């Protein structure tokens, strides 16, 4: 009912590893850029 079976799972393996590795890398890169806005500090200094 499904000859692929074996290959389908070998792929699923490769998928998890790359998926693991990649989600990580990109999570950093996303935080990296955003830091500029995350750390950002603002103050309201109306004139007197």
Ligand X SMILES: CCCCCCCCO[C@@H]1O[C@H](CO)[C@@H](O)[C@H](O)[C@H]1O
Q: Which residues in this chain contact ligand X in the complex, by CB under 6 A?
A: 7, 10-11, 14-15, 18-19
The owner of tokens 């692929």 is 4
What is the biggest distance separating any 2 CA atoms in the chain, rounded to whole angstroms?
80
Q: Closest CB to ligand X among 22 and 34?
A: 22
Q: Closest CB to ligand X among 19 and 24?
A: 19
Q: How far is the CB of 6 from ligand X (least distance, A)?
A: 9
DSSP-derived letter for residue 3 is T
Give the residue nearest to ligand X (CB): 14
């Amino acid at each position: 009912a499904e000859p692929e079976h074996d290959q389908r799972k070998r792929m699923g393996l490769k998928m998890l590893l790359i998926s693991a590795l990649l989600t990580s890398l990109l999570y950093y890169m996303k935080r990296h850029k955003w830091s500029v806005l995350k750390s950002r500090k603002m103050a309201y200094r109306p004139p007197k």
